[PDB]
Ligand SMILES: [Ca+2]
């Protein structure tokens with residue numbers, strides 16, 4: 001069997017500090033030992049965001065974390081006898097910051113210029129609007145963006161001219177009518193909303209200039 005790793009849920013509240021796991025060294029009864037820790041987040045920037053009870057070897061986190069700032073922390077423990085002799089070899093402990101969804105997805109832009117041709121046939125791909133999300137796009141949907149249009153303008157010759165692939169944010173003519181003659185440009189309001197379209201959201205525009 002083996003020892004499992006250590007992950008600590010970001011943005012935690014309750015009271016601080018909090019007990020991660022517990023450290024040891026068989027020189028428990030043989031002498032007196034004092035545990036300490038080295039690394040960033042311990043004895044380096046960020047300064048002591050992690051501490052260990054010298055007499056119990058109880059790891060600790062004296063505040064909340066940001067998986068966007070640092071998702072993983074690497075921490076090293078040491079054992080010393082009351083007299084100043086390392087009894088154990090510096091052991092390494094790894095601490096993972098799980099994620100939570102506190103990031104509004106961000107359209108890479110606010111104004112995505114675009115262009116379509118009159119002929120165009122219902123299916124023609126006109127352009128694409130694109131966004132980013134920094135929450136754990138790898139082990140949570142928390143960075144799963146889902147696109148939709150909010151308001152087209154002018155709404156002629158029909159409400160709902162173009163449409164947008166949710167999954168990839170591409171706009172394609174949805175029905176016919178585009179007539180450069182009377183509606184030369186169009187102003188689409190796209191909306192990216194993470195969590196597969198059930199969480200944080202943002203918006204930007206799309207200017208589809210109909211061509212001859
Ligand atoms: Ca965060």
Ligand SMILES: [Ca+2]
Nearest residue numbers: 103135142194
């Ligand atoms: Ca998010």
Ligand SMILES: [Ca+2]
Nearest residue numbers: 099100102135
């Ligand atoms: Ca996050």
